[PDB]
Structures are given as structure tokens and as C-alpha cells.
Amino acid sequence: MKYLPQQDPQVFAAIEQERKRQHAKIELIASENFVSRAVMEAQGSVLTNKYAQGYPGRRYYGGCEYVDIVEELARERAKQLFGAEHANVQPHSGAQANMAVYFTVLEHGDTVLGMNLSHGGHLTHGSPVNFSGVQYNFVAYGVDPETHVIDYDDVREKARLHRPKLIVAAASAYPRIIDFAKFREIADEVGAYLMVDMAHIAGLVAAGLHPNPVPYAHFVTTTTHKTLRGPRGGMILCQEQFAKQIDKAIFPGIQGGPLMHVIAAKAVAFGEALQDDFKAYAKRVVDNAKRLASALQNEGFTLVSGGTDNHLLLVDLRPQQLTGKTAEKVLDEVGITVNKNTIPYDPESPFVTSGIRIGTAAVTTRGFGLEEMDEIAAIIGLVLKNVGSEQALEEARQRVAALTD
Amino acid sequence: MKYLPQQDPQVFAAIEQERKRQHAKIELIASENFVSRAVMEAQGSVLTNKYAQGYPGRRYYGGCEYVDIVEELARERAKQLFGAEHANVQPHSGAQANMAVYFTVLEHGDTVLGMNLSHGGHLTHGSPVNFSGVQYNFVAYGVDPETHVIDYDDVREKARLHRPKLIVAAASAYPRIIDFAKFREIADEVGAYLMVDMAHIAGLVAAGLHPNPVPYAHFVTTTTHKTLRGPRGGMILCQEQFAKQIDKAIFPGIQGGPLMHVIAAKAVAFGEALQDDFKAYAKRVVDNAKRLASALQNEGFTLVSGGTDNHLLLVDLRPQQLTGKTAEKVLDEVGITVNKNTIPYDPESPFVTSGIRIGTAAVTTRGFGLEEMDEIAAIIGLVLKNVGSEQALEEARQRVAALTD
Numbered sequence: 062m063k064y065l066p067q068q069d070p071q072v073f074a075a076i077e078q079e080r081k082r083q084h085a086k087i088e089l090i091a092s093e094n095f096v097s098r099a100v101m102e103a104q105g106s107v108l109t110n111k112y113a114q115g116y117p118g119r120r121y122y123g124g125c126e127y128v129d130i131v132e133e134l135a136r137e138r139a140k141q142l143f144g145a146e147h148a149n150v151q152p153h154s155g156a157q158a159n160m161a162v163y164f165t166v167l168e169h170g171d172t173v174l175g176m177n178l179s180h181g182g183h184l185t186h187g188s189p190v191n192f193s194g195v196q197y198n199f200v201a202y203g204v205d206p207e208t209h210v211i212d213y214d215d216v217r218e219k220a221r222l223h224r225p226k227l228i229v230a231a232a233s234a235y236p237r238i239i240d241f242a243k244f245r246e247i248a249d250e251v252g253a254y255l256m257v258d259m260a261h262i263a264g265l266v267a268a269g270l271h272p273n274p275v276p277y278a279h280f281v282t283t284t285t286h287k288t289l290r291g292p293r294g295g296m297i298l299c300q301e302q303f304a305k306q307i308d309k310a311i312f313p314g315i316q317g318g319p320l321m322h323v324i325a326a327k328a329v330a331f332g333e334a335l336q337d338d339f340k341a342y343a344k345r346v347v348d349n350a351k352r353l354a355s356a357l358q359n360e361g362f363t364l365v366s367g368g369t370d371n372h373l374l375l376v377d378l379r380p381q382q383l384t385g386k387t388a389e390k391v392l393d394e395v396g397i398t399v400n401k402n403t404i405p406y407d408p409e410s411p412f413v414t415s416g417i418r419i420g421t422a423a424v425t426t427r428g429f430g431l432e433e434m435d436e437i438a439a440i441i442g443l444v445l446k447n448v449g450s451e452q453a454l455e456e457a458r459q460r461v462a463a464l465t466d
Numbered sequence: 467m468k469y470l471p472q473q474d475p476q477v478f479a480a481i482e483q484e485r486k487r488q489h490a491k492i493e494l495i496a497s498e499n500f501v502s503r504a505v506m507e508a509q510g511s512v513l514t515n516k517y518a519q520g521y522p523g524r525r526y527y528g529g530c531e532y533v534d535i536v537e538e539l540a541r542e543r544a545k546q547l548f549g550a551e552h553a554n555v556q557p558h559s560g561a562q563a564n565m566a567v568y569f570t571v572l573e574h575g576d577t578v579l580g581m582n583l584s585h586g587g588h589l590t591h592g593s594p595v596n597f598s599g600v601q602y603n604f605v606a607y608g609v610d611p612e613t614h615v616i617d618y619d620d621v622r623e624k625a626r627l628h629r630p631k632l633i634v635a636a637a638s639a640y641p642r643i644i645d646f647a648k649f650r651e652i653a654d655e656v657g658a659y660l661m662v663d664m665a666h667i668a669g670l671v672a673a674g675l676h677p678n679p680v681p682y683a684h685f686v687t688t689t690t691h692k693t694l695r696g697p698r699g700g701m702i703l704c705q706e707q708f709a710k711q712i713d714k715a716i717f718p719g720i721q722g723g724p725l726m727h728v729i730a731a732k733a734v735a736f737g738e739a740l741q742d743d744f745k746a747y748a749k750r751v752v753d754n755a756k757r758l759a760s761a762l763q764n765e766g767f768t769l770v771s772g773g774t775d776n777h778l779l780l781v782d783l784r785p786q787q788l789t790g791k792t793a794e795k796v797l798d799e800v801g802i803t804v805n806k807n808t809i810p811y812d813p814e815s816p817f818v819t820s821g822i823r824i825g826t827a828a829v830t831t832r833g834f835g836l837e838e839m840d841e842i843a844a845i846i847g848l849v850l851k852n853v854g855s856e857q858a859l860e861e862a863r864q865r866v867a868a869l870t871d
Contacts, residue, residue, distance in 0.1 A: 062511075068504040069734050071539055076730060079532040080512050090527060095515055099473040104727065105510015106467075107485050109691070109698050110500055122495060122805055123798045127484040134476055153558035156722040164597065169574050190718050192569065286514070293514050293725050313595050317561040320698050322509065325481060329474050393528045400527055 091420025138331035152295025264288030268343030291330025356438030385414030496825025543736035557700025586637035669693030673748030696735025761843030790819030
């Protein structure tokens with residue numbers, strides 16, 4: 062940076078702290094990642110100056126010829142990447158991507174079936190303090206209390222009883238592969254649309270390490286950050302027959318002018334995802350996640366579902382008589398960033414929890430491998446089994462510093 | 467840029483075209499501006515990597531200590547700037563800022579009074595193809611058919627008859643000063659909340675050139691781009707008593723994780739707005755707008771409301787037997803960017819219109835002054851009075867090139 066250090070010392074200093082923080086800590090929040098310098102440059106471009114309400118070739122302002130190329134590059138790269146017939150790259154967030162789809166197919170008060178929030182479902186999948194649970198009548202399907210795998214007979218029973226107009230699949234904290242074919246089969250039985258929120262797994266889907274929801278869902282929503290390693294924002298994929306209504310739901314439906322500089326960064330992130338090395342990256346994410354799971358079990362930790370199929374895992378902390386809140390706090394003390402997360406059938410409230418959620422996408426981006434995963438699990442073991450020992454936490458602190466150079 | 471040119475030639479080339487386009491054209495879209503290099507650097511920062519769901523000191527993720535400083539800087543600078551008791555700097559857009567306020571005070575189907583869309587009201591003020599007109603029962607107040615000034619007796623009659631829960635004030639195409647005291651007086655008479663959408667005039671309000679809605683409205687919404695000359699995004703200002711509900715409506719209400727890199731850029735833009743030279747800038751915007759209005763009248767053009775009080779003006783093209791569509795197209799041919807805009811009581815559809823909207827915020831940022839305003843009006847006269855003459859349009863083309871160096 063050249064001009065921000067001189068114009069705004071206060072803001073620059075805080076950014077510089079955050080930059081140094083990101084390097085110092087072990088980042089294990091499952092929804093986080095580090096974007097490339099090229100993605101950031103696209104976000105810091107003069108494209109923020111342009112109003113481009115509407116769509117490429119169908120704008121409401123003149124002078125859009127070049128931001129039209131940028132958006133079309135984003136749409137076409139997304140479609141090549143996921144095999145989708147249509148892409149909308151204008152959603153400001155994953156929240157707005159979901160919102161737009163709900164706006165498309167639903168009327169106020171319609172019944173929607175989604176995943177239990179305490180079992181892995183997202184806030185936008187029907188929380189009563191969220192627009193989704195306020196606007197629409199959400200019902201939940203759950204996971205098996207022993208395997209923590211989605212109970213597909215429960216999905217089917219809840220669908221046949223409640224008769225939802227929409228079924229939502231996918232999660233913020235589900236460590237196994239989702240069967241999208243089974244979700245569609247249930248959707249077809251009850252005549253409901255199927256929406257898949259692939260926000261967490263989108264990078265793995267692109268790399269062919271998770272089954273692709275695109276051939277099974279009427280609508281696929283996602284974030285561009287997370288495993289896709291793009292800028293912060295949303296995207297909708299859908300069949301050609303829904304394209305017009307989905308575009309209209311985004312604008313003039315729920316948004317105005319899109320963020321063209323972020324759309325540029327999305328296109329950059331998609332270009333990176335089409336390359337071979339991102340495929341190799343994404344495999345290392347899954348490999349690392351499996352290795353970290355195995356290594357934590359070796360330490361004596363119980364994991365929700367007995368391991369992982371994707372980028373994330375959940376530690377069930379009850380055997381150690383620890384809450385997620387406690388674990389989160391003490392790991393933060395030694396430089397390991399996790400978040401407390403409800404485990405399925407959690408005896409604690411969502412604000413305390415019995416679990417921590419861990420993901421490998423960020424540390425894999427930094428270059429961490431299988432050896433590093435073993436060490437991370439060893440540090441977590443040392444910390445969580447010696448919560449009252451300050452010399453153990455200092456040892457952990459030093460071992461975290463060794464990993465981050 | 468260093469890394470984007472090598473990683474993504476296609477995206478870089480399109481950005482570079484857009485950068486060169488912005489310099490070449492006369493930008494007169496009233497909602498547009500050019501941000502500083504420091505604002506852009508803040509947007510292209512590593513702050514995109516951070517999940518910060520929640521609020522400063524009350525986050526749902528650890529590691530937020532420094533993005534907390536950034537957001538608090540944005541909130542405090544906004545509050546100092548507008549004299550507001552509370553600021554929410556997380557809205558992704560002006561659309562989401564409005565959405566959050568509606569979510570706060572209204573139930574599905576509640577009656578809301580806003581400005582006629584054909585008279586200057588915004589899309590989010592009750593368009594039937596927008597969430598606002600679909601979720602809520604919108605009624606409209608109009609302007610005087612002769613003066614094109616808001617008819618405050620009409621606002622009062624519509625309020626007393628329809629009994630709205632919410633009254634909305636402010637516009638996308640209204641060239642006069644809004645009386646917020648009169649709006650509040652009407653609101654108090656009928657027991658309605660008052661929301662002011664100051665998106666267009668926010669920079670002038672900061673500089674003390676437009677009356678401040680903050681002391682009169684329960685809620686003030688705005689964009690950070692436009693006259694405030696910040697990054698693309700939204701903001702809500704409100705009294706302390708609504709602070710909690712407004713924060714909850716943004717999250718977990720209608721959004722998830724905020725865009726911290728954009729929030730950084732907002733803080734930068736607010737820092738710039740607190741300085742003396744932005745005050746001088748904003749006066750030149752209004753001075754230029756008045757001068758451009760006077761100069762277009764000198765050319766023989768009729769202006770909606772007979773001129774302007776702010777940054778924007780509207781040309782009523784009926785005397786020249788031209789549509790806004792035609793004018794927009796032919797001005798685009800010579801390098802002048804305007805948009806067609808419905809004039810109050812327009813005999814044409816919103817897709818054709820009888821008017822063009824013009825603003826001076828962008829050209830004032832580039833350094834244009836009173837002499838330049840005279841020239842711009844002279845070029846518009848030459849173009850619109852000689853629509854069928856290719857040598858007049860070439861002359862205009864050359865004179866536009868002279869203005870942009």
C-alpha cells in the first residue's frame with residue numbers, strides 16, 4: 062500500500078495488525094481461507110466506481126461494455142467449473158444468494174424443509190431470528206443420533222408429512238458427503254423444489270472431490286469464499302428454465318447495483334479454480350482433513366460421525382468434560398483459531414456447545430501438509446488435556462510459533 | 467497491479483479498458499463518483515479473509531481484535547460526521563440498508579408511505595417488482611405538477627387516509643431540498659415511524675449543504691458511494707433506542723458475515739469526509755450543479771423544478787420533442803454519460819421516459835469547475851438540437867475530448 066499509510070494511519074495500522082495476525086495464528090475456522098494477491102487486486106480496482114444495475118448487454122446504465130466482459134467471464138467460468146446451465150454472480154453474500162432463491166419460488170409463509178440447525182444446518186436455513194424462519198415456515202430433518210449421518214428416511218418422512226414447497230440441503234457443520242440424488246428423489250416424491258447450499262464444499266465440488274449437486278438441484282447456492290478460495294460474496298447456479306426468474310429475484314428483486322470489483326475478483330477466483338494446481342490444492346485439503354481427524358482420534362478425541370469426508374471435522378468434547386466455549390477460549394490463548402459448534406443432539410445451548418468445528422482449507426493454502434496436521438493434533442491434545450497448566454499452554458504457544466515460521 | 471496482469475490477462479485487460487473509459491468519458495450519472503486510491507487499497511486488503519459475524523466486542527468468531535478497531539473507526543467517524551447516536555456500517559448495499567429497517571419496524575403486509583417512483587422515489591421505496599412492494603403495502607405521495615416540489619399536503623393526506631406504519635422520505639431523482647421536519651410532523655400526526663433514505667445527498671449532508679435528516683428521522687439509510695464518495699455499500703443511522711433491533715435486523719436478520727475490507731474502505735471514506743477539503747469539494751458539487759442548470763437553461767432546456775438545490779438536475783425534453791431514451795443514446799455517441807429518467811407526470815413509460823438525469827459529483831472530483839460546466843451545457847445543446855447531424859456530433863466528440871485532456 063502507498064496512499065492509505067499516509068491518508069489514514071489509524072486504518073492502515075489496524076489492517077497491518079490483521080495482516081500480521083493472519084500469518085501468526087493457526088487458522089482452523091472451516092469457512093475461512095486466504096485469497097491470492099490477484100483476487101485482492103481485482104477487489105481494489107476502479108470497478109467500484111461503476112453502476113451496473115441489470116445484466117450484461119441488458120444494463121440500465123450506459124458505459125458498461127467492459128464490466129459486461131468481466132461479469133460474463135465470471136458467469137462462463139462458473140458454468141464451465143460446475144457444469145451449470147446458468148450462473149448469477151451478483152449476490153453480495155451467501156445470505157443474499159439464498160434469499161434470492163427463496164424470493165423466486167416461495168410466497169410468504171410457505172413450508173420449507175431444511176437441515177436441523179443444531180445438526181449442521183445454516184442460519185439462513187430457517188433460524189427464527191433470521192429472515193428465512195420469519196418469512197417462511199421451516200421444518201427440520203435430522204441426523205442419526207449414533208452415526209451423525211443425515212437420516213434420509215427422516216428427510217422423506219418430514220417431506221411427506223409437512224409437504225414443503227422447497228427442500229434445502231447442505232450445511233455449515235456436516236463432515237460427511239451429502240447424497241443429492243436421494244434429496245431429489247424425496248423432492249420428486251412430494252413435488253418440492255430442491256435447493257442445495259454448497260457454500261462450504263464448493264471448492265471440493267469444483268475439484269471433483271465432492272459429488273456435484275448441479276444435476277440434482279433446481280437451484281444451487283454458494284459463497285465464493287470458503288473452499289472455493291475466492292472473494293467474499295455469493296453465487297446462484299440453476300437450470301436454464303429458472304434463469305430469468307433467478308436474475309429478476311436478484312435484480313430488481315432483492316438487490317440493486319452489483320459490486321463489479323468483487324465480480325471481477327470472482328472471475329479471477331474461478332480462473333484459478335479451473336487450473337490443475339487448485340485441483341491438487343483441494344485434494345490436499347481433504348487429505349489434510351482426514352489426517353487431522355485420524356491424528357485427533359489418536360490423541361483420544363471423539364469426532365462427530367467418526368471422522369470426515371470433506372474439509373471439516375467436529376470434535377465432540379463431552380468425553381473430556383469440556384464445552385466448545387472452553388476449548389475455543391483456551392485454544393485462542395495459544396494461537397489456534399477454532400469456533401465452538403453445536404454437535405448433533407447437544408445437551409448445551411448454541412452459545413456454549415459441546416464441540417469445536419475445525420477446517421483445513423486455510424492451513425492447506427499456507428502450505429501445511431500431513432506432518433503439520435499431526436503436529437496440530439498434538440498441540441490440540443496437549444492444550445485440551447491440560448487446560449489448567451500454564452507451562453503446557455506456553456509449550457503449545459511455542460509449538461504454534463514453530464509451525465507458522 | 468502486479469499479480470493480476472500475469473495470472474488473469476482477460477480480466478486485467480477488461481479492467482484496464484474500464485479504467486481508461488472512466489478517464490475518457492464525461493461522467494454525469496448522478497449516483498456515480500471516483501473514490502480515492504486509499505479507499506481502493508482498503509478494499510483490496512487481506513480483510514476479505516476474515517469472518518466477523520456479529521459486532522465489535524460481540525463477535526461469534528475469535529481473532530477479530532483488529533477488524534473490531536476498523537469497524538469502530540467506521541462507526542465513530544460516521545457518528546461524528548452526521549451527529550447520529552448509532553451507526554451500523556455492515557449493510558452490503560443501500561438495498562440491504564433499507565431492507566434491514568423495513569425488517570425492523572414492519573410485519574409482512576404493513577402499509578408504508580413513500581415517494582412516487584415516477585416522481586423521484588427509489589426502487590426500494592415500493593416497486594411491485596421489488597421486495598419492498600411485494601412484502602409491504604406501499605402507497606405514494608407526489609410532487610406538485612407545476613413546481614415539481616414535494617406536495618407536503620399530499621404527504622399528509624396520504625398519511626391520514628392510508629395510516630402507514632412507516633413513512634419513507636428521499637429520492638433517486640429529486641433536485642430540491644427535502645423538508646424532513648415536515649415529514650416528521652406528518653409522521654407524528656399519524657403515529658408512523660419516519661425513514662429517510664439520504665443515499666444521494668449524504669455527502670452534501672456531511673458538508674452542511676443539505677439539511678440533516680438525523681434529528682428528524684427514527685431511521686436514516688444511505689449508500690456510502692454517490693456524493694459521500696466512498697466504496698460501494700450501505701449504512702444505517704438511528705437513535706440509541708433502535709440500535710439493538712437495527713443491529714439484529716442486519717445480523718442475524720438479513721445478512722451474515724460483513725465485508726470487513728469494504729468496512730475498512732468506509733472508514734477511510736468517512737475520514738476523508740471529516741476533512742475540510744471534502745467540505746470545499748461538496749460545495750463545488752452544488753455550485754457546479756447550479757451552474758450547469760443555469761447554463762442548460764441558457765441553451766433553451768426546461769429543467770424539472772426549474773433548477774436544482776443539490777448535486778443533480780433533470781432535463782424535461784418534451785419541448786425538444788425528444789425522449790430520454792433518444793437523448794441518452796446520442797449523448798453516449800459523443801462520450802457523455804447520462805441516464806434516461808422519468809420526469810414527474812411523464813407521458814412515457816419508465817423504459818422510454820421524457821427526461822435525462824444529470825449529476826456533477828463525478829466531474830467535480832476530476833477537477834471540473836464553472837467554466838467546464840458551461841462547456842458541458844454547450845456540448846449537450848449542440849448534440850440535442852442537432853440529433854441528425856453527424857458533423858455536429860463529431861464536433862461534440864472533439865469538444866468532449868478537449869475537456870478530458
